[PDB]
Design an enzyme around this catalytic site. Sequence first.
Site, short mmCIF file in Angstrom:
data_model
loop_
_atom_site.label_atom_id
_atom_site.label_comp_id
_atom_site.label_asym_id
_atom_site.label_seq_id
_atom_site.Cartn_x
_atom_site.Cartn_y
_atom_site.Cartn_z
N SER A 14 0.82 -1.19 0.00
CA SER A 14 0.00 0.00 0.00
C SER A 14 0.86 1.24 0.00
O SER A 14 2.03 1.21 0.39
CB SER A 14 -0.96 0.00 1.20
OG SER A 14 -0.31 0.35 2.41
N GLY A 15 0.27 2.35 -0.42
CA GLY A 15 0.98 3.61 -0.49
C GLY A 15 0.12 4.62 -1.15
O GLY A 15 -1.11 4.55 -1.04
N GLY A 18 -2.96 3.39 -3.15
CA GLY A 18 -4.05 2.64 -2.49
C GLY A 18 -3.53 1.33 -1.90
O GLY A 18 -2.41 1.27 -1.41
N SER A 19 -4.33 0.27 -1.97
CA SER A 19 -3.96 -0.99 -1.35
C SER A 19 -4.17 -2.06 -2.37
O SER A 19 -5.16 -2.05 -3.07
CB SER A 19 -4.79 -1.24 -0.08
OG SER A 19 -4.66 -0.13 0.83
N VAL A 20 -3.21 -2.97 -2.47
CA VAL A 20 -3.24 -3.96 -3.50
C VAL A 20 -3.09 -5.33 -2.86
O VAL A 20 -2.13 -5.54 -2.13
CB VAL A 20 -2.12 -3.73 -4.52
CG1 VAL A 20 -2.11 -4.83 -5.56
CG2 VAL A 20 -2.30 -2.38 -5.20
N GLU A 86 -3.75 -8.49 -13.92
CA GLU A 86 -2.79 -9.61 -13.98
C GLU A 86 -1.92 -9.70 -12.74
O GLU A 86 -1.45 -8.66 -12.24
CB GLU A 86 -1.83 -9.45 -15.14
CG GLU A 86 -2.28 -9.97 -16.49
CD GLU A 86 -1.12 -10.05 -17.48
OE1 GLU A 86 -1.03 -9.12 -18.29
OE2 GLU A 86 -0.28 -10.99 -17.40
N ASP A 93 9.18 -7.34 -7.48
CA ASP A 93 9.38 -6.06 -8.14
C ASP A 93 10.86 -5.68 -8.15
O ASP A 93 11.68 -6.27 -7.43
CB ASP A 93 8.44 -4.97 -7.63
CG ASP A 93 8.74 -4.51 -6.24
OD1 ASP A 93 9.87 -4.66 -5.75
OD2 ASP A 93 7.79 -3.95 -5.64
N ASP A 132 5.60 7.89 -14.09
CA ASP A 132 6.16 7.39 -12.83
C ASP A 132 6.98 6.10 -13.09
O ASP A 132 6.90 5.10 -12.36
CB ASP A 132 5.02 7.17 -11.82
CG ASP A 132 5.49 7.26 -10.34
OD1 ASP A 132 6.62 7.75 -10.07
OD2 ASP A 132 4.70 6.83 -9.45
CL1 LIG Z 1 1.96 -8.83 -8.12
C1 LIG Z 1 1.20 -7.34 -8.64
C2 LIG Z 1 0.27 -7.28 -9.80
C3 LIG Z 1 -0.24 -6.13 -10.11
C4 LIG Z 1 0.11 -4.90 -9.29
C5 LIG Z 1 0.94 -4.96 -8.28
C6 LIG Z 1 1.51 -6.32 -7.94
N1 LIG Z 1 1.31 -3.80 -7.47
C7 LIG Z 1 2.26 -4.09 -6.39
C8 LIG Z 1 2.59 -3.09 -5.31
C9 LIG Z 1 3.16 -3.77 -4.07
C10 LIG Z 1 4.62 -4.20 -4.27
C11 LIG Z 1 4.70 -5.76 -4.25
C12 LIG Z 1 6.05 -6.31 -3.85
C13 LIG Z 1 6.48 -5.53 -2.61
N2 LIG Z 1 6.72 -4.12 -2.91
C14 LIG Z 1 5.49 -3.43 -3.23
C15 LIG Z 1 0.71 -2.55 -7.89
C16 LIG Z 1 0.96 -1.24 -7.23
C17 LIG Z 1 0.35 -0.17 -7.68
N3 LIG Z 1 -0.57 -0.24 -8.85
C18 LIG Z 1 -0.81 -1.33 -9.43
C19 LIG Z 1 -0.11 -2.55 -8.91
O1 LIG Z 1 -0.49 -3.69 -9.67
#
Ligand SMILES: Clc1ccc2c(c1)N(CCC[C@@H]1CCCNC1)c1ccncc1O2
Length: 270
Positions: A14-15, A18-20, A86, A93, A132
Site C-alpha cells: 500500500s501507499g 491505495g492498497s493492493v 494480472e 518487483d 512514474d
Molecule cells: Cl503482483 C502485482 C500485480 C499487479 C500490481 C501490483 C503487484 N502492485 C504491487 C505493489 C506492491 C509491491 C509488491 C512487492 C512488494 N513491494 C510493493 C501494484 C501497485 C500499484 N498499482 C498497481 C499494482 O499492480
Amino acid sequence: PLESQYQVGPLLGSGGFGSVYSGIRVSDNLPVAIKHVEKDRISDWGELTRVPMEVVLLKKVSSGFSGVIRLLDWFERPDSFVLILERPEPVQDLFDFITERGALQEELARSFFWQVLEAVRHCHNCGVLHRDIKDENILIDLNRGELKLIDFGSGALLKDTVYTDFDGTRVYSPPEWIRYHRYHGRSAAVWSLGILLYDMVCGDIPFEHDEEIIRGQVFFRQRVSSECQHLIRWCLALRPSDRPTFEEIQNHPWMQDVLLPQETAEIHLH
Ligand SMILES: Clc1ccc2c(c1)N(CCC[C@@H]1CCCNC1)c1ccncc1O2
C-alpha cells in the site's frame, strides 16, 4: 458480484496508489491483483461513465500482449474503485530485486532495460504517458524473465504540448520540472529512464535532493562500462532537446545483443 467472483489473499502493498491484494479469479483459478483506490484520493478522472484515469489508460493499452499489466476488470463502490489486474507468479518487483541483489550485472540491466523501453514505446504508441517510471513500478515474472509496467495512476493521455502538473516521484523528475514546473512527455520519460538505468547498474539512484537534480552531474560509485555511462549521461542531459529519442536509446552501442527474456531467466534468475 465482486466478492463471489474473486478470492482475496494477503495484502501485497500500500501507499500513494491505495492498497493492493493478492487474489484468485474463482472462475478460471487465474492469479490476479486487486487494487483499491479511494475516491477522495483521486486527483484526476476520465470518461467512457466517470472513472479514475488509470482505468482509461489501461484500456487503451490492454489490447494485445505486452510488457504492461492488463486491466482484467473493474468495479465501482460507494467510496472506492476496485481494479482487477494480472498477477504473475512467481513475481518480485525491481525495487525489492535491487534492494536484495545490489547493483546488477550489465547483461541483466541491458535485458531489463530493453524490455522497459519496449513497454514504454508500446504505451506511447497507444496514446498513454506513464509519468512514474521507476524500480517500484516494474515487475519481474521470475520464470519467464519478463518485465511488466504497473501503476498508471499518475499517467496521462500523451500529447505534444507541455504538461504543468506532475504527481510522480520527485527524485525521478526532470530538472525542467524542478525549476519551471513544465515538461514534455517523451523527454521527461527519457530522463526517468536515465535514472532507472543508473539505479540498475549502481544499486541506487543518482540524485537525492533538488540541487543535485538541477546540477545533473553523475558520479559512479560502482564499476560501470564506459558505453553504459555514456547512455546514462545522454538520458540525463539537462536540456530536454539534448536527450535521445527511444530510437536512439535502442540503437545505442550498449544496447546491442540483448538477451531474450527466457535466456535472461535461466542465467540470472533460476
Ligand atoms: Cl503482483 C502485482 C500485480 C499487479 C500490481 C501490483 C503487484 N502492485 C504491487 C505493489 C506492491 C509491491 C509488491 C512487492 C512488494 N513491494 C510493493 C501494484 C501497485 C500499484 N498499482 C498497481 C499494482 O499492480
